[PDB]
Amino acid sequence: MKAPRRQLTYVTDLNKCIGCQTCTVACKKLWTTGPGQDFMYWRNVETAPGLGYPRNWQTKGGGYKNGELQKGKIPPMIDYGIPFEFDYAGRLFEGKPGRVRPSPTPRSAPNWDEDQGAGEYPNNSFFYLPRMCNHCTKPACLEACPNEAIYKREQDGIVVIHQDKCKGAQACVQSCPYAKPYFNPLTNKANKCIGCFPRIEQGVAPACVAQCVGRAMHVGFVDDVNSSVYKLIKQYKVALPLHPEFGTEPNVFYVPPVLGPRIEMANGEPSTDPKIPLAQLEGLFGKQVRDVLAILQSEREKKMKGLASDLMDVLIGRRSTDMMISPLT
Amino acid sequence: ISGAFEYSGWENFHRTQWSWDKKTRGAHLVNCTGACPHFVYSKDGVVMREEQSKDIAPMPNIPEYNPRGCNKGECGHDYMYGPHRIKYPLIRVGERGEGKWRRATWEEALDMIADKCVDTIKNHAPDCISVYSPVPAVSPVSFSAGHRFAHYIGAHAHTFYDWYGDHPTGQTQTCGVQGDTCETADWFNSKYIILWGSNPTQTRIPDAHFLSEAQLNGAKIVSISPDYNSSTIKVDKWIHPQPGTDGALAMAMAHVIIKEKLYDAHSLKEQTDLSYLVRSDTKRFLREADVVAGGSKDKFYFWNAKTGKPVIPKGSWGDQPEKKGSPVGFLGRNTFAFPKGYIDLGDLDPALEGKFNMQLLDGKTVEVRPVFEILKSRLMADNTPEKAAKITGVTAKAITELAREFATAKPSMIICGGGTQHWYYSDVLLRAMHLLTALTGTEGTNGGGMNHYIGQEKPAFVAGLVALAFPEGVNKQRFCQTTIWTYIHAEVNDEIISSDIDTEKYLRDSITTGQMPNMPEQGRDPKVFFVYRGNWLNQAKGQKYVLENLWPKLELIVDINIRMDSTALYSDVVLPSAHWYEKLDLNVTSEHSYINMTEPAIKPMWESKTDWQIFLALAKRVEMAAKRKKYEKFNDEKFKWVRDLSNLWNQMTMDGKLAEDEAAAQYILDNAPQSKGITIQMLREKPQRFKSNWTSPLKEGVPYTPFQYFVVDKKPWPTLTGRQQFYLDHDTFFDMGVELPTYKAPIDADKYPFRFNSPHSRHSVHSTFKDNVLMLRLQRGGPSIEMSPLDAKPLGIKDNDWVEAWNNHGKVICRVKIRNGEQRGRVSMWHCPELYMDLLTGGSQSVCPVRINPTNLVGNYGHLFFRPNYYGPAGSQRDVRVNVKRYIGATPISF
Numbered sequence A: 001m002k003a004p005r006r007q008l009t010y011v012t013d014l015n016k017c018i019g020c021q022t023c024t025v026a027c028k029k030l031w032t033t034g035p036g037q038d039f040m041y042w043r044n045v046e047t048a049p050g051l052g053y054p055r056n057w058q059t060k061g062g063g064y065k066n067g068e069l070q071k072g073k074i075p076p077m078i079d080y081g082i083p084f085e086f087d088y089a090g091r092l093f094e095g096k097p098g099r100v101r102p103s104p105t106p107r108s109a110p111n112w113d114e115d116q117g118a119g120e121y122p123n124n125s126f127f128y129l130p131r132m133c134n135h136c137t138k139p140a141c142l143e144a145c146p147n148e149a150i151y152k153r154e155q156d157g158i159v160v161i162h163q164d165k166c167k168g169a170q171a172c173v174q175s176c177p178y179a180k181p182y183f184n185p186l187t188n189k190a191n192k193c194i195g196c197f198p199r200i201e202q203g204v205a206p207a208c209v210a211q212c213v214g215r216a217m218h219v220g221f222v223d224d225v226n227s228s229v230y231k232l233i234k235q236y237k238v239a240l241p242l243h244p245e246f247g248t249e250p251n252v253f254y255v256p257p258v259l260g261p262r263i264e265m266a267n268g269e270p271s272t273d274p275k276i277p278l279a280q281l282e283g284l285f286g287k288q289v290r291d292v293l294a295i296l297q298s299e300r301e302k303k304m305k306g307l308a309s310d311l312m313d314v315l316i317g318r319r320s321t322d323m324m325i326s327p328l329t
Numbered sequence B: 001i002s003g004a005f006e007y008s009g010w011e012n013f014h015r016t017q018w019s020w021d022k023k024t025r026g027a028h029l030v031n032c033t034g035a036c037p038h039f040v041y042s043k044d045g046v047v048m049r050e051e052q053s054k055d056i057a058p059m060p061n062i063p064e065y066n067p068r069g070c071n072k073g074e075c076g077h078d079y080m081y082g083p084h085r086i087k088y089p090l091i092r093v094g095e096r097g098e099g100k101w102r103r104a105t106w107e108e109a110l111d112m113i114a115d116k117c118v119d120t121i122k123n124h125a126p127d128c129i130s131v132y133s134p135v136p137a138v139s140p141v142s143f144s145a146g147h148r149f150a151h152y153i154g155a156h157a158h159t160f161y162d163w164y165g166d167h168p169t170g171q172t173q174t175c176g177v178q179g180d181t182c183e184t185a186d187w188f189n190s191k192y193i194i195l196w197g198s199n200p201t202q203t204r205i206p207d208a209h210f211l212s213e214a215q216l217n218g219a220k221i222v223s224i225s226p227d228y229n230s231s232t233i234k235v236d237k238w239i240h241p242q243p244g245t246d247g248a249l250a251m252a253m254a255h256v257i258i259k260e261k262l263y264d265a266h267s268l269k270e271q272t273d274l275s276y277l278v279r280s281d282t283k284r285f286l287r288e289a290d291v292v293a294g295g296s297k298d299k300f301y302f303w304n305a306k307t308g309k310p311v312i313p314k315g316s317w318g319d320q321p322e323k324k325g326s327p328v329g330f331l332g333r334n335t336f337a338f339p340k341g342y343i344d345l346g347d348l349d350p351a352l353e354g355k356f357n358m359q360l361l362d363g364k365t366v367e368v369r370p371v372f373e374i375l376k377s378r379l380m381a382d383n384t385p386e387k388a389a390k391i392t393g394v395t396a397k398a399i400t401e402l403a404r405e406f407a408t409a410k411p412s413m414i415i416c417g418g419g420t421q422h423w424y425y426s427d428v429l430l431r432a433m434h435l436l437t438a439l440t441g442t443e444g445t446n447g448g449g450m451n452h453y454i455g456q457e458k459p460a461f462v463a464g465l466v467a468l469a470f471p472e473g474v475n476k477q478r479f480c481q482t483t484i485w486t487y488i489h490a491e492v493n494d495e496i497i498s499s500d501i502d503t504e505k506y507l508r509d510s511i512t513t514g515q516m517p518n519m520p521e522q523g524r525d526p527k528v529f530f531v532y533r534g535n536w537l538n539q540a541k542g543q544k545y546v547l548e549n550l551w552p553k554l555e556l557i558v559d560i561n562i563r564m565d566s567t568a569l570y571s572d573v574v575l576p577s578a579h580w581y582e583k584l585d586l587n588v589t590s591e592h593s594y595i596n597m598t599e600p601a602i603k604p605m606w607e608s609k610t611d612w613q614i615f616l617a618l619a620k621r622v623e624m625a626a627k628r629k630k631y632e633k634f635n636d637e638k639f640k641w642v643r644d645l646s647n648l649w650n651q652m653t654m655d656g657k658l659a660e661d662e663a664a665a666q667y668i669l670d671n672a673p674q675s676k677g678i679t680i681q682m683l684r685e686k687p688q689r690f691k692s693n694w695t696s697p698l699k700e701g702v703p704y705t706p707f708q709y710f711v712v713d714k715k716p717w718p719t720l721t722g723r724q725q726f727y728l729d730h731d732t733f734f735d736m737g738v739e740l741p742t743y744k745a746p747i748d749a750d751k752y753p754f755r756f757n758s759p760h761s762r763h764s765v766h767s768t769f770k771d772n773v774l775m776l777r778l779q780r781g782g783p784s785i786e787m788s789p790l791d792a793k794p795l796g797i798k799d800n801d802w803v804e805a806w807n808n809h810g811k812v813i814c815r816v817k818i819r820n821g822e823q824r825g826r827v828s829m830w831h832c833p834e835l836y837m838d839l840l841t842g843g844s845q846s847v848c849p850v851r852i853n854p855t856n857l858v859g860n861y862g863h864l865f866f867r868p869n870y871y872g873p874a875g876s877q878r879d880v881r882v883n884v885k886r887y888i889g890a891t892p893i894s895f
């Protein structure tokens, strides 16, 4: 497989993601405008808790156990959601009566369960989880590809599926535990997030990062000690990878949400528990989140007393260049 | 490896996807408040994509604005090549609303409008023609096209600030300004923020990053929303009262602050009216005319504790400013003419409490009391936290702690929105929010104040926009009050009985006595209706009354639009307007202090024209319709104006000087102190910041915050009292029981069990982007309406079922999203989807009537007078109550 000279790394701040779906649109309006790509959202944001995109992708299968490769399910098209199509021209211009209904009958969609979450009023809880290709150090897709069509670049660690070597084996879609490769039924090929390597080769951050409206996306190379990505992952150690039990070691990381109101007791008074259950942040990111929440909580208390906290200043990112590769283009 | 890796050759398939041969500056001209700077990327004459330019010069020590943008803006080019786009002028051949058209030439379509327009002036009146074009800050050149057109032919324009409910009606009553707020960068300067009926995670997307970054910088945020909305997941405190009961929460917070002596007494003595003396006999302000012969009715008294004598406060309505200034649009009077430090408290010590005796001309002594005294006595009795707990559903101790925290943190700031402004009694509610701000003394301080955020409603360079839109004078222009306009011509039944609130009495007396307008005059019907840059029919409250009663009264309805919206679908002629990336226009907002713009990435597509060039093309057809019909000049006695329709094009262009889109845009900048010196080329390169503002001096590197001309420079407030006026001793205010801030329970005239909420969704900018295919695939395929499972379960309603909402005004059938964050007893349908979307009948506005608060009709009380978008009836709709039923005509299974 070979190891790359540099590994491009992302950090998503779940304390700032507003779930506005801008990163989703910027990726789709740039990379997934092609034939057979209408259902593919390489960059997608989903509500946690929820079933995600595609539906139930966390029980799908793939990644690694005991160093051993698992072949999970190939999600049917209904789990990704049939993209709704409409006959506007008939109603608006051609005098055809009847509402412009979506086809098919809505039963699934990438963002179907937006802000439903879990828990009863007044303790309902949810937050947003922007997902993408993790560009893992142990890519399970690359490992499964029996044509060796996928490859990991030596320059920036990005994983790209070679569209000429790809013969449609779909083994990458079986063995990826994040369901980020998508089989294109019109080209009989697998398409996936390309990590914006044409933009990074020119020194411009990825579209999901550069166009992140919530100002929650971080990008850079972890070998650079001046990158906020390094400081959040290596120095302050508040950024964790999504689902590390898959054994793939992702290269995109998450700061767990420390903002949020507390559980409301039956008398209306607040308790110590936040509305976001720790048991859920554990199920997503493992056992370290409790220590990370304490570091974030402790450092935010410093700012509340008018004191200094360099970890907060990294998350705040008063200047976008302190956050990412230059987003100007 | 040589110098390129094994696969560099093929990877050009991806490098070519992110390529272009042309980059231009583009903006999205929708009522969004974003105004975000973008770059447009074209290749081979085809716009490929758009992206935030991220070129706003940051302010020191505060996070930068960039990237800005949103999910709708990053696919705004879908309206260039999508199936909704109008390509040619369309003439209706079927019935209104059927979508049965015949393609027509511009000449045929512009002749037909010119023929009917000239007919309407001749046989009826010029004010039977009207033009509706909203929020000029979004596209001021396009706004000025149809308004300048109506300006010279005699048609009447409309209002929108109030008709939408964006107008902080309670702020104009208190401060005498049209409405102002700090730019969102100053949210970072705050220590305690209250998101009060505001959901900025969905409704302030390009600006919402300052809130979380403030909390990561030590600040605290509170969310006051009946539902656990998207923004609440980040705040530190969540208060969820019953819908519309926020006034009882605010007044109970004032009680605690006043009882526990937490307020800024000096700020109260200087900048407020609570020290003004009120007579205990007539409940009126004690006036100079009451005590001194030849005294002014617009001069009052406070009691000075330093001298033990009554003193006339300085700068009220009867006090003139020596050397006057010109009237300012966003002010009741031009108090900027007064010298600096005019209302400086100095050595004065106005008493806030106490009883005193004053004796008048007539011989009798009367007991007088300061406004702060009467308010305190009513707060201690009526507005205790325990009594507010039984009204709002928020515990008295949570109410007490919220008040102690709001008064202690400095600075503290209230950010309110549609959740608190779109109620029938939202004026008295914002007055309660201004009282809480006045008590804490945070108005005019960075990180403090009472800040409102609604539509894109602040054109800072209003003077230059006035010059392009109404060249011969805003006093030589007809305006209707569109909330009144719709209510009357659509023959709305607002379900409010006359013995409770006699709306018809207040409405008619206001009109026949000149306080509010009613056009067309003499009771004539409206006949011609120009709709562009707004989806008037789809967004209109009282929509079912409009379709049945007003819409038939119009003989010609023209819609100039880039797409086929619901208004154009029900129109007689639809004209294609150029896309945002095909036109030249300015674009500004109140959320940040920069001038954004759009420029043509390519030529206007198909047969489309820009709004400015459309009304110029129609001006020449009307020039010749008048020639043919021998009605070229006519006398308009309302302004003593012999109009010349034969020379309309020269009046539209200043004899050709403003014939082109960039010329009119430069004319706006050249005639306003906020932007003079800025040219189009400067804006084409980098977004330029304003050079001045409205109610404060704009300072380099410091976020703007309003009202600092009065709180810092001590110029009088443009109110009848010259101060922040909380006592409004008008007859109509006594009748409604709101002479002071107090709790007014929401309207229950709709005898139905569910309160009907309709907030704004992150998935669209009003009706625009509702029918965007990418937006619908990011939801459930169509419109949505939300219920709590505690209400849907006894009704047999499952998630994604069709549900049926109705009251006496209409009925809507829509698919439901059951949400645990939804509060029981209320249902939230994201406001105004297009009628042709996934709705089985009607829309959100079918269940909404048009209601008029009599306090919004007052036009003879100092700073309370009609000015287009400065005062007038608000188009509230959050009091609406509906019933919910499961629609069983279709029950699809889920799998």
Ligand SMILES: Nc1nc2c(c(=O)[nH]1)N[C@@H](/C(S)=C(/S)[C@H](O)COP(=O)(O)OP(=O)(O)OC[C@H]1O[C@@H](n3cnc4c(=O)[nH]c(N)nc43)[C@H](O)[C@@H]1O)C=N2
Binding pocket: B029, B030, B031, B134, B139, B142, B164, B165, B166, B418, B422, B455, B532, B533, B534, B535, B536, B539, B540, B541, B560, B561, B562, B563, B565, B577, B578, B579, B580, B611, B758, B759, B760, B765, B766, B767, B768, B831, B832, B844, B845, B848, B877
């Ligand atoms: N129950 C309830 N009711 C409510 C509300 C609520 O909260 N609850 N909200 C209110 C409020 S506050 C507002 S601001 C209205 O929704 C605003 O709607 P508006 O028609 O102005 O813009 P919209 O986005 O809808 O449509 C704008 C039209 O203009 C087109 N357009 C946009 N740009 C241009 C242009 O440059 N030139 C031309 N000729 N047209 C352009 C646009 O396509 C759309 O048709 C009102 N109703």
Ligand SMILES: Nc1nc2c(c(=O)[nH]1)N[C@H]1C(S)=C(S)[C@@H](COP(=O)(O)OP(=O)(O)OC[C@H]3O[C@@H](n4cnc5c(=O)[nH]c(N)nc54)[C@H](O)[C@@H]3O)O[C@H]1N2
Binding pocket: B031, B032, B033, B166, B196, B197, B198, B199, B200, B202, B203, B204, B205, B224, B225, B226, B227, B229, B242, B243, B244, B245, B246, B416, B417, B418, B419, B420, B453, B454, B455, B456, B757, B758, B759, B760, B761, B762, B763, B764, B765, B766, B828, B878
């Ligand atoms: N994507 C997008 N953004 C927008 C807009 C858009 O159309 N699309 N519209 C813009 C403009 S024109 C507007 S006016 C603003 C409106 O946007 P907002 O200021 O956010 O107002 P709303 O969305 O109507 O309601 C805000 C929250 O207050 C809740 N609420 C309802 N009633 C009450 C009440 O009585 N008391 C309290 N405390 N809360 C209540 C509502 O449920 C909601 O969660 O947003 C602007 N931003």
Ligand code: SF4
Binding pocket: A016, A017, A018, A019, A020, A021, A022, A023, A024, A045, A128, A130, A211, A212, A213, A214, A215, A216, A217
């Ligand atoms: S853009 Fe930034 S904030 Fe909006 S969703 Fe994607 S990540 Fe979360």
Ligand code: SF4
Binding pocket: A132, A133, A134, A135, A136, A138, A139, A140, A141, A142, A159, A175, A176, A177, A178, A179, A180, A181, A192, A248
């Ligand atoms: S994320 Fe899924 S696809 Fe992207 S690299 Fe890791 S495994 Fe292969």
Ligand code: SF4
Binding pocket: A026, A027, A028, A031, A042, A043, A132, A133, A193, A194, A195, A196, A206, A207, A208, A209
């Ligand atoms: S990085 Fe480039 S490719 Fe990977 S998701 Fe964000 S946008 Fe789509």
Ligand code: SF4
Binding pocket: B027, B028, B030, B032, B033, B034, B035, B036, B068, B069, B070, B071, B072, B073, B074, B076, B206, B765
């Ligand atoms: S839509 Fe409104 S907010 Fe989103 S980008 Fe265009 S302007 Fe900025």
Ligand code: F3S
Binding pocket: A144, A145, A146, A147, A148, A149, A150, A161, A165, A166, A167, A168, A169, A170, A171, A172, A173, A189, A190
């Ligand atoms: S397994 Fe390999 S062959 Fe293509 S379909 Fe997947 S990349």
Ligand SMILES: [Mo]
Binding pocket: B164, B165, B166, B454, B455
């Ligand atoms: Mo609005």
